[PDB]
């Protein structure tokens, strides 16, 4: 009930509106793909930065990239677990059961794509 200039700014509302989570109309698989791409791309960084084999040249990038891909896989598994636990029973289609399942599939696809993109970007 307590509106703030932070939570009611037009710029903040427009920045939240065009995000894949709060998009007006977009199929949930595309939202999952964008979510996975962005979050895998940011997650690959800390894994290649200060991993267990950071001092080893060449091995650091591949080890961090597979660590990020594995973490993306666990995140997709937990996303599917949330979808099965919360939406088992019965107007936004993403919050539906099969919509959230398609979102999870798009999320793991986008996460693998983002990990591969981070690999091919840090290789060059």
């Amino acid at each position: 009930m307590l509106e703030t200039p932070v939570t009611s700014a037009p710029i903040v509302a427009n920045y939240l509106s065009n995000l894949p989570a709060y998009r007006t109309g977009v199929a949930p698989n595309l939202r999952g793909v964008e979510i996975g791409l962005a979050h895998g791309f940011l997650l690959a960084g800390p894994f290649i930065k200060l991993g267990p084999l950071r001092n080893v040249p060449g091995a650091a990038e591949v080890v961090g990239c597979m660590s990020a891909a594995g973490l993306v896989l666990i995140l997709a598994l937990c996303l599917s677990l949330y979808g099965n636990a919360a939406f088992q029973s019965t107007s936004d289609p993403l919050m539906s059961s099969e919509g959230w399942a398609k979102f999870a599939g798009g999320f793991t696809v986008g996460g693998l794509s983002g990990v591969a993109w981070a690999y091919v970007l840090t290789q060059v």
């Binding site: 939240l16 995000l19 989570a21 709060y22 949330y82 636990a85 919360a86 993403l94 919050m95």
Partner: protein, 147 residues
């Protein structure tokens, strides 16, 4: 803890051959604190250090582990319910009134642990820390100088 302190110190002094040390040192509690708790902990805490590592590194680690679980038992024992219930209420408001994270919601409402549950969890952490700490100290002291 008292019976195991007595057994451990008497047997350690017997194995070292300095039974007179236990005879003239178990009389006063400073002897218990110094000649048993402080003297025999030198090899335990030196399991890992910036200098290196000996075979008792795992015992030092689980000794600190036991002290930490004892501390978490204190965490669950001193405070009882109401602060945690109000804190969880504030966290519920924070989660409900934020963008990009209010889409995912809990199926079961987060609540503070019950007072009986508080006593049980504090007792469990206390006992686990007690057991792990004394097992670490006992095994490390009896194995660092004997075989």
């Amino acid at each position: 803890g008292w019976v195991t302190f007595y057994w451990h110190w008497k047997h350690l002094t017997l194995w070292q051959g300095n039974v007179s040390q236990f005879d003239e040192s178990s009389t006063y509690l400073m002897g218990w604190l110094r000649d048993y708790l402080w003297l025999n902990s030198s090899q335990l805490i030196n399991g890992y250090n910036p200098f290196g590592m000996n075979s008792l590194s795992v015992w030092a680690w689980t000794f600190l582990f036991g002290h930490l679980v004892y501390a978490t038992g204190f965490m669950f024992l001193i405070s009882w319910r109401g602060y945690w219930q109000e804190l969880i209420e504030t966290l519920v408001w924070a989660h409900e009134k934020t963008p990009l994270a209010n889409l995912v919601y809990w199926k079961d409402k987060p609540v503070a642990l019950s007072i009986v549950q508080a006593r049980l969890v504090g007792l469990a952490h206390f006992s686990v820390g007690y057991i792990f700490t004394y097992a670490a100290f006992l095994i490390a002291s009896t194995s660092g100088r004997f075989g």
